[PDB]
Design a binder for these strands. Structure first.
Ligand SMILES: [Mg+2]
Ligand SMILES: [Mg+2]
Ligand SMILES: [Mg+2]
Ligand SMILES: [Mg+2]
Ligand SMILES: [Mg+2]
Ligand SMILES: [Mg+2]
Ligand SMILES: [Mg+2]
Ligand SMILES: [Mg+2]
Ligand SMILES: [Mg+2]
Ligand SMILES: [Mg+2]
Ligand SMILES: [Mg+2]
Ligand SMILES: [Mg+2]
Ligand SMILES: [Mg+2]
Ligand SMILES: [Mg+2]
Ligand SMILES: [Mg+2]
Ligand SMILES: [Mg+2]
Ligand SMILES: [Mg+2]
Ligand SMILES: [Mg+2]
Ligand SMILES: [Mg+2]
Ligand SMILES: [Mg+2]
Ligand SMILES: [Mg+2]
Ligand SMILES: [Mg+2]
Ligand SMILES: [Mg+2]
Ligand SMILES: [Mg+2]
Ligand SMILES: [Mg+2]
Ligand SMILES: [Mg+2]
Ligand SMILES: [Mg+2]
Ligand SMILES: [Mg+2]
Ligand SMILES: [Mg+2]
Ligand SMILES: [Mg+2]
Ligand SMILES: [Mg+2]
Ligand SMILES: [Mg+2]
Lengths: 206, 51
RNA sequence: CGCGACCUCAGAUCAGACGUGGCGACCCGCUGAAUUUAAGCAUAUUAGUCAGCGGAGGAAAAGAAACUAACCAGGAUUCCCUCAGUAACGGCGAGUGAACAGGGAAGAGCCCAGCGCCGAAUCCCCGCCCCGCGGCGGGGCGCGGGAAAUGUGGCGUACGGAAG
RNA sequence: GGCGCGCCGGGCCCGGGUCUUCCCGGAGUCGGGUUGCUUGGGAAUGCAGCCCAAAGCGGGUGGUAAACUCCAUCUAAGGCU
RNA sequence: CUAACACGUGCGCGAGUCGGGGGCUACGAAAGCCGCCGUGGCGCAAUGAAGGUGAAGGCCGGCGGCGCGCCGCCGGCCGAG
RNA sequence: GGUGUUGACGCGAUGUGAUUUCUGCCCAGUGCUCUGAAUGUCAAAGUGAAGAAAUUCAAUGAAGCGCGGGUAAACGGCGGGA
RNA sequence: UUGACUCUAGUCUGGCACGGUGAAGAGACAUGAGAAGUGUAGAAUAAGUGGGAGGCCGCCGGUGAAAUACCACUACUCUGAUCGUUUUUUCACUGACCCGGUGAGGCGGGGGGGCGAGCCGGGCUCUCGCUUCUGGCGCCAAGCGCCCGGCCGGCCGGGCGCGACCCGCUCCGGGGACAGUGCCAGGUGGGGAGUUUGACUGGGGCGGUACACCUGUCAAACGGUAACGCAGGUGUCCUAAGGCGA
């Protein structure tokens, strides 16, 4: 699709805020409807995007650190998770699925995925929830900020998609850059080009 | 022929629309180009119906 | 009802022109066989040939790439040598069969419509004067007629071009 | 008759470089299907009838049909020499 | 009679050979000449459908490899049955 | 365009050949004609699906063939042994 | 000539184009509205998915699970109905196209005027519009009305309209998007074309194959050797009837 249509759409919603003037956190949302992708066939799409926007940012993180993590994660006010806490809630597994109800996406260090696949990893991957790795750069500054919003374009049997991007008061150019990279990587992750999507629609949470 | 092709694109029978245009136009490249410009025309119709 | 514009379309022994037919060796467009060969014959071959028809010129046609190529790349057309009896076609039988590159003969390039900008700046014809007149032309004068805005002329054409 | 010389009259009162801004193209035609003829041209070299019938970073060519994708090469459907 | 082929014989040159096409200078439309006009033909190389490849070898010195006396690779000698 | 300046007491296509007396049987064959609906068969175009496409597959299915009536003053044919 | 081979004008049939206009019938759809989104565990009738943190004055937790529940518009499926896209069938329309007639002579509406029908002089609906005893004639306007010119109310000569209604978009009729034509496709096609219709042989034809092979003889003690010489055979058959061993 062209560019002036999403420019006019974001302009129309940023002056049509006065339709609601919400009592909640004010944010917009991308939703995708597409035409004939069959659900039972193979080659489904499951792809993470890297996004340096953090468009939603109200987001809650829980990290699971090795050594060299403890007081620095607690000084950036991120909860350190330890082997004693993993066994504390591996003796019964049920409360961390409510931690998938509080928190959305976690973060992990690099060694813990021999301790994890005992029972609780395959027990609690049943939410869309596996904690994300770090690398040997060993930095949490802005690495947690870009490993959040690694957006899962995930295939389902239903012919519909919704993408979590955008709030009302970020800058206009960075938002149209955000949904620029969003829709072009989504078309490139689809099995074919712009014919494969039936509707692009950008309107908001309310 | 292109009105009936835009009817098939509103129904979203893209393979049938492409075979229809490549029978009643000629080569497959010309069929692809005319299919995508009819899809552009139909998107502009949807934007006109929207706002 | 009439008168007046334009548009379509007639009639003139109207004013001025033009075409018709012949020759046809060479040239262009079309039509187009069968003998013959295949040891028969039907596809092929004879053959885009003979016959037929139309149209010219002193030459005609072609001709300045919607090209050849695949290289370190050439550069309109036509003709000669060669490519080559090769690639290819063909009851893959008989038979048919070009081109590119290379060397030479020759050698030349250009113009519109469009896009535009200049007061139609354009053109034809009749009358009068001067000159020239056996290739009807040059100049001036006509509040002389007409064409043309449903587009004439100037600049401009793919090698770019225009204007400031 | 031509090439040379001079006069009268008439026409044109013309160019090149750089920068900036504009502008640019030929349709029942290309092309596809089918049929027939021709061609060395072989999943159709060219020509024609019928039917379909375009596009503009497009279109044609790139000697095996086709799809994807880079390239190379020209600019057809107007005219003179 | 023309063309093509094959073999035999005469002639010139000979791993070359040939200007036939073009050009330059009465018989003579002949003749001569070109060589940075050998383009090209045929010959000097064959085989393969094609991708393609494309016409002697031996000895010496050195560094069972083992239950490359063969020799892999380097320096010398003899060298084309 | 002829029949046609015509219209079934006409035009066109056949056989047999005045008169009198008759004109027997056969529709199995080959023809001709009638009907389009059991199973058939069936071209191009159109339709649908698969495939990246050329392409492949499937369904639908005109006439004619088949199948079924009629017809011998249509071509023709019209037994044998005890 | 035909039941030969290969085709052919002609003819039958189908498709496409010329090829349009409406109204109904069957749909297939798009679209607007409407309602089920009942496994179990779960205050439960959880279709799926992602955002989501307080209106109005359920819920953010927690409870169970594969999976939540304010609010927003997302796309899926199923069932009734409105509307506009196309296919199909029937009935119509005419304007392309075809046919006939004529010296293209009164067409279609309306206005006017007579005859009947029934209502209280009236209208509505309908009908007619002037020719039939006779082998005659029939045109080039009488009459009316209004203007006008020449000469002296009189004379002579003119013009216009009713008479002979008005207005219109095909001359009237008759067919009709089918006959028909153009191009493909199948069928039929001695009406017509082109050609073919083997060989051996005690002439040729009919017969036979001596036409490709095999055995014995011929065949004269190597081999070879003929006729339509002689007596015969073959165009196959076998998972063993091949190969070993006993
Ligand atoms: Mg005259
Ligand atoms: Mg002449
Ligand atoms: Mg012969
Ligand atoms: Mg002969
Ligand atoms: Mg003969
Ligand atoms: Mg020929
Ligand atoms: Mg001739
Ligand atoms: Mg002459
Ligand atoms: Mg010429
Ligand atoms: Mg010319
Ligand atoms: Mg050339
Ligand atoms: Mg040669
Ligand atoms: Mg030939
Ligand atoms: Mg050449
Ligand atoms: Mg002009
Ligand atoms: Mg050019
Ligand atoms: Mg011909
Ligand atoms: Mg020809
Ligand atoms: Mg030929
Ligand atoms: Mg190729
Ligand atoms: Mg390619
Ligand atoms: Mg051009
Ligand atoms: Mg040209
Ligand atoms: Mg010799
Ligand atoms: Mg008879
Ligand atoms: Mg019968
Ligand atoms: Mg036959
Ligand atoms: Mg016949
Ligand atoms: Mg015959
Ligand atoms: Mg004989
Ligand atoms: Mg013996
Ligand atoms: Mg003997």
């Amino acid at each position: 699709v062209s560019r002036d249509t999403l420019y006019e759409a974001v302009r129309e919603v940023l002056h049509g805020n006065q339709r609601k003037r919400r009592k909640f956190l004010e944010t917009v949302e991308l939703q995708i409807s597409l035409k004939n992708y069959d659900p039972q066939k193979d080659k489904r799409f499951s792809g993470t995007v890297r996004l340096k926007s953090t468009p939603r940012p109200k987001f809650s993180v829980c990290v699971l650190g090795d050594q060299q993590h403890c007081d620095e994660a607690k000084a950036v006010d991120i909860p350190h998770m330890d082997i004693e806490a993993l066994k504390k809630l591996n003796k019964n597994k049920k409360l961390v699925k409510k931690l998938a109800k509080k928190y959305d996406a976690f973060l992990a260090s690099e060694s813990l995925i021999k301790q994890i696949p005992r029972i609780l990893g395959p027990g609690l991957n049943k939410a869309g929830k596996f904690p994300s790795l770090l690398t040997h750069n060993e930095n949490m500054v802005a690495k947690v900020d870009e490993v959040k919003s690694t957006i899962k374009f995930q295939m389902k049997k239903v012919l519909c998609l919704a993408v979590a991007v955008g709030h009302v008061k970020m800058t206009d150019d960075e938002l149209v850059y955000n949904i620029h990279l969003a829709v072009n990587f989504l078309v490139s992750l689809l099995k074919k080009n712009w014919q494969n999507v039936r509707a692009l629609y950008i309107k908001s949470t309310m | 022929y292109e009105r009936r092709a835009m009817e098939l694109l509103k129904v979203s029978k893209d393979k049938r629309a492409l075979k229809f245009i490549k029978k009643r136009v000629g080569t497959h490249i010309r069929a692809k180009r005319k299919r995508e410009e009819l899809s552009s025309v139909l998107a502009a119709m949807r934007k006109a119906a929207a706002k």
